[PDB]
Amino acid sequence: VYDQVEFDVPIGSRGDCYDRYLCRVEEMRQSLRIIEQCLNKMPPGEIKVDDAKVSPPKRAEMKTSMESLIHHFKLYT
């Protein structure tokens, strides 16, 4: 999501090691603007895709459902 957060790229003008420093200091400031948006707009939801084939099954599920233990065993091994 860098399409749903708003920031300004700090383009420098001339290229001396100062303009590059100033750009790096601005990106720290612009990142605080992006961090602000992320805390303000973080959605309720799951943190990993729900396909057991790609992301490992949850600890409770692998210890109670056979399809999850098989998926945990195969994914880790």
Partner 1 sequence: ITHTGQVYDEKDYRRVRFVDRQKEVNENFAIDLIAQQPVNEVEHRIIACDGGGGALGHPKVYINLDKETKTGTCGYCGLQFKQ
Partner 2 sequence: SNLIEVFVDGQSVMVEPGTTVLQACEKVGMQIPRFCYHERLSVAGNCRMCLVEIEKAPKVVAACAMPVMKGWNILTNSEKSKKAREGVMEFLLANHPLDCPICDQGGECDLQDQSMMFGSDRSRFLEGKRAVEDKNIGPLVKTIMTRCIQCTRCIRFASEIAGVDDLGTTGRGNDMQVGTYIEKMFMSELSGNVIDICPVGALTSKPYAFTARPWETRKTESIDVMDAVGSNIVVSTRTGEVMRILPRMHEDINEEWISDKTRFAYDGLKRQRLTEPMVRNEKGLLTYTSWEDALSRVAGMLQNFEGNAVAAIAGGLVDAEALVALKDLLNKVDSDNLCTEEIFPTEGAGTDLRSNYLLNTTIAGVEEADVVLLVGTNPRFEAPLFNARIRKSWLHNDLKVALIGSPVDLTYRYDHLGDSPKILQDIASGRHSFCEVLKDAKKPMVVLGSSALQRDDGAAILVAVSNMVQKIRVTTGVAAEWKVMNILHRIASQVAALDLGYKPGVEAIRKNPPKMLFLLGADGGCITRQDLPKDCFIVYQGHHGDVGAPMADVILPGAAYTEKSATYVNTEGRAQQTKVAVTPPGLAREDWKIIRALSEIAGITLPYDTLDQVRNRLEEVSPNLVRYDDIEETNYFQQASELAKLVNQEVLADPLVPPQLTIKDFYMTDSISRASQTMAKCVKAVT
Q: Which residues bind partner 2 (CB under 8 A)?
A: 50-53, 57, 61, 65-71, 73-74, 77
Report whether 17 belongs to an annotated binding site. yes
Instruction: Please report the sign of the dihedral spanned by the C-alpha atoms of residue 44, residue 49, residue 55, residue 61.
Output: positive
Answer whether 34's CB lies under 8 Å from 8's CB.
Answer: no
Report whether 22 belongs to an annotated binding site. no
Is the CB of 37 or the CB of 65 nearer to partner 1? 65
Please give the residues from 41 up to 70 whose contact with partner 1 meets the rule CB under 8 A.
Answer: 59-60, 62-64, 69
| Shortest Cβ 43–partner 2 spacing (Å) | 23
Is the CB of 26 or the CB of 61 nearer to partner 2? 61
Residue 44 CB contacts under 8 Å (≥ 6 apart), including other chains: none
